[PDB]
């Protein structure tokens, strides 16, 4: 920070507002097109939404830094060094395919996740001159067009586009955690109320760029733009913009890290045992290359990405359009679901039930009062208005339409949460009818009609009305109170201020029948381990009653007022053991989701509201609907076609299947590779030659992975997808430790069979031995898949899908017939005598039966 720029801000904050208009050449009405153009030409332009794009060459490097590709490149270069061009070329092709696949996937991710902030859809509210004749108005212009000395208006949830001086403010609060480091918002006043000057960042009359407005409204004037902002650049995200990678790529990286760990503790050991026993350190390093390449699945990223892609494709037919590949991983493992009640628990169809007055008696004059407000409205079509319109009879409707004529209408606004319609049956007096939320109705009503008699509205009547609508809400009934007022005829236009001293004729009640499909869906969601939570903005009574029909156990309720007082940890503790949250603002939903995220649960939020998008952004997975507002869809992570918990439940089941397959392949390949590597290690000392060469091991792995291409099409047992899928190397390591030595035992048997029975006990005839262990190693690896895929019995209690069973047969045929081919010469393999095949079959059958029997010892 420059000291010179640290004094101009203080001077402007302490400068009188009277002289501020002339200093920046700004008028109270605003800035015209010519004035704005001159200011832009002279001072410059503000921070443009455009940012530095990632070059094609630069993106390839970050697309390559992942540890798996580094390990593969190291192995390929080493194989090139040790006079092995074929293996090095194959490894190079594998790493190139991996890089291209990661490239296309990362381009898709960048399309899905361009940056932390779009900075393009963000605009600013400026006065300007819309009519160009001094009429002015309100415009939504990009922040880049904000010139210095421009009058702007601030509202809650709007980030500061540039440095501004507060001219007028009404309870304006700004979160300056980025600049000042304080999370607590600092109130901003029109005049500097701070006693001590010389603190430009702490000045209450100055707001800097990069900060947001927590609450309140204000009208400030821009003082700096472009590089003149105290933030400086605030847009130099040229490189390392996506510091956090996909959780999917993170999973692949940690899986590769486990195997790298195993290599770094096993390859040196082999180098020692064979290399000290014999003394040929070149062959010792060749053994080290063999063990290092033994456990390194070549197409691990290819198979995992294929599995996730197939999951995403088959979810598309289940009305679950998943945006990103990574989203499936979080979708399977999700265990807490936070949804609003309207549209998921209850169908959005809203029928009308009852015509009660303040006394609760069924009164039809309340329907007469309500019908005019709905019919004589010219605003946006309302489904509730059509409901109350249908509620009334046709003859009475025609009589009312003939008797009354529309005069004026008050549009519905969130500030008052009410809408009023002015109608008149004659030219002497006019009748104003207003409907809305109950509390806002009593706030504007001073008298009520009790049993058809006008009575002053005292406190006892307020309490009795509160009790009766409390009973209505406990029934599950959305109460809407209707108010009427008689005023003399006038030529003026009625405004929101005219809704005062009205007479509350009665209350109308509406109910939402819960979806017929939602009860089994909620019963099944708990059968999948998913805990359903309701974060609803409606009344606590209505939500509690709604939870009863569906079958969800409301238990004790939590009101959004209480959660405001609590801190992060206590609120997280409360939210862990509570199911329903009511009377919630969007920030409350975001905070509750973030606090639920802490303990490790993968929390997903489902919403289709305009203000619901930040909750979608915060959660581990944001589920929205195609029929929602566009911004929510762009901020989501799964856009299912229609709001239904049955569709989401089936989507979760399929997203668990995709995870079970993707993890099952990892465990199978890791265990088999570790078994082969262990066998190489234990027999490294005794064999004067390599058990199997790297070119032999690499081809075996490639063919096994080709047989692993059908894994995404496998049939997952219902036991696997019955709980959230967790991914941790702690269990992968012990699975490898258990299921490696079982393979190593039979590989030792194969070593002994070659050494003694077939007399391949001389380094001049190592090819028969090396070739011989290759056929059995490649056959057993693919054959053990059917034994170890399922905890239950291998063929009579749980079978495998056709693609998997087939590809296994094809790879077996390729492996057996590979030595009997011209390709044997280039692969350093040779033909095998017919006496081998019965021994091969015996070894494979023994390995299968043994492994199936031992299998029960995991638990
Ligand atoms: Mg093996």
UniProtKB/Swiss-Prot annotation:
It comes from the Bacteria. Mediates magnesium influx to the cytosol. Interacts with MgtS. Belongs to the cation transport ATPase (P-type) (TC 3.A.3) family. Type IIIB subfamily. The active site is at 340 (4-aspartylphosphate intermediate). GO terms for cellular component: intracellular membrane-bounded organelle; plasma membrane. Upon Mg(2+) depletion, MgtA is stabilized by interaction with MgtS. It holds the Pfam family Cation_ATPase_C. It is an enzyme of class 7 (translocase). InterPro entries: ATPase_P-typ_cation-transptr_C, ATPase_P-typ_cation-transptr_N, ATPase_P-typ_cyto_dom_N, ATPase_P-typ_P_site, ATPase_P-typ_TM_dom_sf, ATPase_P-typ_transduc_dom_A_sf, HAD-like_sf, HAD_sf. CDD domains: P-type_ATPase_Mg. Its EC number is 7.2.2.14. The gene is mgtA. Residues 83, 276-284, 683-691, 758-766, 819-833 are extracellular. The chain crosses the membrane at residues 62-82, 84-104, 255-275, 285-302, 663-682, 692-711, 734-757, 767-785, 799-818, 834-853. GO terms for biological process: cellular response to magnesium ion; magnesium ion transmembrane transport. Residues 1-61, 105-254, 303-662, 712-733, 786-798 are cytoplasmic. Mg(2+) binds at residues 298, 608, 612, 676, 701, 705. It is found in: Cell inner membrane. This is Magnesium-transporting ATPase, P-type 1. It catalyses: Mg(2+)(out) + ATP + H2O = Mg(2+)(in) + ADP + phosphate + H(+). Induction: Induced by low levels of proline and by osmotic shock. The leader of mgtA mRNA functions as a riboswitch, favoring transcription under low Mg(2+) conditions. Under limiting proline levels the MgtL peptide encoded within the mgtA leader cannot be translated, thereby favoring the transcription of the mgtA ORF. Induction by osmotic shock also depends on translational regulation by MgtL. Induced by low extracellular levels of Mg(2+) via the PhoQ/PhoP two-component regulatory system. Keywords: ATP-binding, Cell inner membrane, Cell membrane, Magnesium, Membrane, Metal-binding, Nucleotide-binding, Phosphoprotein, Translocase, Transmembrane, Transmembrane helix. It is a multi-pass membrane protein. PANTHER family: CALCIUM-TRANSPORTING ATPASE. GO terms for molecular function: ATP binding; ATP hydrolysis activity; ATPase-coupled monoatomic cation transmembrane transporter activity; metal ion binding; P-type ion transporter activity; P-type magnesium transporter activity. It comes from Escherichia coli (strain K12). The lineage of its organism: Bacteria, Pseudomonadati, Pseudomonadota, Gammaproteobacteria, Enterobacterales.
